[PDB]
Amino acid sequence: FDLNDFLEQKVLVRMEAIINSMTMKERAKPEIIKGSRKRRIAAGSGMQVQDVNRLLKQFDDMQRMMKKM
RNA sequence: GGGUCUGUUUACCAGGUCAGGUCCGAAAGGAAGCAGCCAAGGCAGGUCC
Secondary structure, eight states: OOHHHHHTOOHHHHHHHHHTTSOHHHHHSGGGOOHHHHHHHHHHTTOOHHHHHHHHHHHHHHHHHTTOO
16 A cells, blocks of 8 residues: 555645655655655645645555554 | 667756646736656667767
8 A cells, every 4th residue: 555545545635736746666665755855745746844744644544554444 | 989779777966848736926927846758867788980
């Protein structure tokens, strides 16, 4: 389960916006998204880094469910 | 090494177009710009000077 699968599910518009700024590698293996990329992703989507942090957290929570849900 | 072809590779670090999203503007309209793709560079192989 990854961002691709999370993407496949207004607050919803921005979320997409954040994911539409990542590379394929980032979507498939989210844990590689650190300081420099979050920043690339936030500016690239007109969002704040903390916006990206929340997005990744909501994704994390779900990724946890997949295997225990 | 240079021309060229083929495969492959490359988040941001001043290429093109820039979906989506964003910024400025009362509006008319402006501007920046991620991913993609393309270009380009890297690694090889063919071929040629």
